[PDB]
Write a protein that binds this DNA or RNA. Structure first.
Ligand SMILES: [Ca+2]
Ligand SMILES: [Ca+2]
Lengths: 229, 236
DNA sequence: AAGACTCTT
DNA sequence: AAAGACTCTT
């Protein structure tokens, strides 16, 4: 299927620098700010080839602070849009998975298409293991030092891997499970369903203070449902 | 000087080169996206070699942050005068049509400027200058090396300038939740020429160290340079 | 857990 | 505008 083909293509598909039209190659930085944008760029060709093969249109956002990186859909079936978004983090694991106060609480905030038009939200997660100030020429490619000791990727539904603790404070992001690479691949989350994942993050309080009288984790949210919300 | 050479070297490479993609040691090339999250990354990678060449040329050592949320991108200093360090940070913004007014976000106003060692590679006091290399670009399949000349670039124009942070600093925040200083809202010439609003680096520093986080909080203190001057006039 | 590191209306 | 969207480190 689209999903299994994409997953296979992803595993199938070593970036070592940026290159100018003139043939000069500048090496990469060793931080996630750098790598996150590289991985995103490295993935576009793949997503588009596969979608192409399955009859879907791929679409990127116009406004820069919009979810998701790639919106896929058939023109005959438009209300069955798939959302794919790249997330990166490093090892020497857990991800940040987006805001919990935007499109999940408000159908049209910072989202390319209204949230109810997406039937799936896949996360493509890259994990790289943390390990030059000169420029190179096309032929010194094998002398340029890579800024990572290795890389692993996976595709998985956002709900399956979401955790119950916030991923960021002032930028109110959902944190994912804090698990080994395998657990993410297999999909061993904590939410019993996507409906539970949504309800939980649509009612999560922004800070410890207000959270203290509601719920701060999964056991407590469940105890909050029993009490009658 | 270093300042003059750096500007020359930056302005130079910028015109002589157009970055077009990322490349794999196996020779495959991937195109770039036309967003700032992408361009800011490119521009700092594209500047590292130039800053490092010009730096070595003047006996300066160069250090980059070890931790990911530290300023500045580049700390420059001669081992003979480590108490007169230079901080250079790369800022990027875009424009949809050449000649329009632009603005940059210039960093936090609650970190290193308020706490001598919060999120900075070296204590704020060991830095004698804070330079901003600002890049402005006009927004606009895999390839093999023999096609470099054909990959479409994700921008039509790229201008660069080097200027002191205090000189281009404005009086309105650049971001809310992430509490950034916002630059002047002006044309690129004003950034190069240095036509700011502050009179000294001391005033820039005092204004931003007393800027309140929210409008409600500021409404009673000061919300712009004028009110801040009156504020100062009356005894704070 | 909270707060560090450009865009949009 | 002011406020709030878009991985890391105590
Ligand atoms: Ca994204
Ligand atoms: Ca920086």
């Amino acid at each position: 299927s689209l999903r299994s083909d994409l997953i296979n293509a992803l595993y199938d598909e070593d970036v070592c620098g940026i290159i100018s039209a003139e043939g000069k190659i500048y090496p990469l930085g060793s931080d996630t700010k750098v790598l996150s944008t590289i991985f995103e760029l490295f993935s576009r060709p793949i997503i588009n080839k596969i979608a192409e093969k399955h009859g879907y249109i791929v679409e990127e956002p116009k406004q820069q602070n919009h979810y998701p990186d790639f919106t896929l859909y058939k023109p005959s079936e438009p209300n069955k849009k798939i959302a794919i978004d790249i997330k990166t983090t490093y090892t020497n694991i857990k991800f940040t998975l987006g805001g919990y106060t935007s499109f999940i609480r408000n159908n049209t905030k910072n989202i390319v298409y209204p949230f109810d038009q997406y039937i799936a939200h896949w996360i493509i997660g890259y994990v790289y293991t943390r390990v030059s100030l000169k420029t190179y020429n096309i032929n010194e490619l094998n002398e340029i030092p890579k800024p990572y000791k290795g890389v692993k990727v996976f595709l998985q539904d956002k709900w399956v891997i979401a955790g119950d603790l916030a991923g960021s404070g002032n930028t109110t992001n959902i944190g994912s499970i804090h698990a080994h690479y395998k657990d993410f691949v297999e999909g061993k989350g904590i939410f019993d369903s996507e409906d539970e994942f949504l309800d939980y993050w649509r009612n999560y309080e922004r800070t410890s203070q207000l959270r203290n009288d509601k719920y701060n984790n999964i056991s407590e949210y469940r105890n909050w449902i029993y009490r009658g919300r």
